[PDB]
DNA sequence: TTTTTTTTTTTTTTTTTTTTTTTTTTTTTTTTTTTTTTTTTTTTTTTTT
């Protein structure tokens with residue numbers, strides 16, 4: 001409601017925001033402004049920034065196609081203690097219209113909708129669940145893996161078609177569920193073991209993994225230098241970019257910027273999809289489907305929107321590719337087996 | 343012994359019927375009683391030779 005309000009920014013504010021957008025590293029600054037208390041998960045924070053910006057809403061209505069999902073769905077898969085729940089908590093406490101779900105505490109009808117009897121009118125009324133209450137926001141699903149397939153099938157239609165068709169006893173409709181999904185999950189065996197391939201170790205239905213457009217592998221390097229740096233950050237946390245500018249920057253980008261693909265961006269996307277499909281066709285890697293091309297499109301549009309660009313260019317597609325590869329650690333992945341360490 | 347579908351099964355109600363309980367409610371005649379008449383049976387002041 002605020003972002004749609006025409007006089008939300010003074011001219012001074014708009015000029016300051018545009019001056020920020022001209023900075024070479026506005027992307028990194030805005031990403032680093034997120035979850036400032038979390039130590040160097042720069043790629044996860046960039047992905048979450050892109051999720052907060054989101055892709056370009058499109059009207060495919062005259063194409064027979066249906067509704068295209070402009071939302072970015074991120075999955076954080078990693079061994080415990082790596083601060084996934086802290087990131088989900090930060091996004092939960094930062095966005096309007098968000099929901100937090102964890103594990104077995106949610107059901108399928110508790111995420112979609114159900115009938116209760118309003119105890120002020122003595123009338124049965126329909127109540128929405130977590131996935132509809134975040135219809136234009138982010139639903140944070142924690143312990144994604146410790147969550148039974150009954151309720152995780154509900155996510156398929158939400159993540160593909162942004163709608164929630166319910167055909168119950170009397171009530172038939174299509175609730176809107178245009179949510180972004182930020183999911184955090186543990187590997188099978190709750191700890192990444194290096195003897196198993198990525199697919200064997202994430203252990204999610206392979207159709208469901210294609211719905212996420214970033215899978216960040218939050219793996220622990222047995223690295224002593226990182227141990228020391230993280231230890232200093234955490235201990236320093238026991239004794240001692242603005243937000244308002246970030247807030248207004250994102251609001252301005254949502255209001256005014258509608259990135260459109262340029263011809264050379266189009267070509268970059270074609271090449272990127274073909275290459276990524278060659279790469280992911282290996283043994284136990286997360287494969288690429290035509291849905292990952294749209295993942296790239298969404299990420300590129302979001303990145304162009306970070307620049308206040310209004311035009312998607314090769315740099316946006318390049319950053320989409322890079323983010324997609326860094327998540328999943330595809331540089332550390334051989335085309336035969338799992339990964340090792342960075 | 344990790345994952346997974348029938349099975350209830352306790353909890354929300356809703357229906358829903360059958361049964362017991364609840365809620366509502368002045369007018370109209372009649373009759374005794376008192377206070378009057380009214381015909382009749384006395385009875386108490388009138389007068390005569």
Ligand SMILES: Nc1ncnc2c1ncn2[C@@H]1O[C@H](COP(=O)(O)OP(=O)(O)OP(=O)(O)O)[C@@H](O)[C@H]1O
Nearest residue numbers: 037038039040078079080081082083084085086186
């Ligand atoms: N890189 C990091 N930056 C900041 N804090 C961290 C980092 N890694 C770990 N921590 C701290 O360690 C704790 C990790 O717990 P958290 O719930 O965030 O992890 P998690 O990934 O959800 O674990 P699990 O997979 O078991 O759910 C948090 O208190 C967090 O503050």
Ligand SMILES: [Mg+2]
Nearest residue numbers: 084085142143
């Ligand atoms: Mg957690």
